[PDB]
């Protein structure tokens, strides 16, 4: 009825040290996504952006925009300071139905160039994770893509469940 490459466990999944918001915030173009609910179809991928809203209260808002038949769709949610600085909870998770577990994690960044962040949630009691790479342009170096797809498969993450959705000028800027 189902079958998921399983979570890594949190070992596995590094977080920023001396994790900086101030200096986190802003837009950023998913340049890579990964994840065992991520399938690469040849038949592709937009790329589309994300904007993280440093609010007065420490908190993220946020907003996502992506080019989609044929408009200009945004979706914009809460990610409020968990545990340790670079970890975040969903703001409002009661009112996602079926959503009952949800982490964010920024793994690794230097802030002015590239991210990567990790995503897990429980969904209708399954199991999810993923792994974006975030890049303050639309385009990023071999080197910062090549060390993604290796953090990809260390968590179990086979090539085809590892895409780059491609560069669009539509919405995201
Ligand atoms: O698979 C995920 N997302 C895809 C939609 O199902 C996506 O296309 O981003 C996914 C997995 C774990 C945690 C998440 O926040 C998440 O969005
Ligand atoms: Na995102």
Redesign the pocket.
Known sequence: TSDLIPAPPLSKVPLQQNFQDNQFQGKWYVVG?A?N??LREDKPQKMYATIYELKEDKSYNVTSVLFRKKKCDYWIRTFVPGSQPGEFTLGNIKSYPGLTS?LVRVVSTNYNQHAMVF???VSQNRE???ITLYGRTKELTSELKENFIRFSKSLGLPENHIVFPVPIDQCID
């Open positions: 996504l994840g609910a991520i949800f995503f897990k949630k999810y994770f993923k």
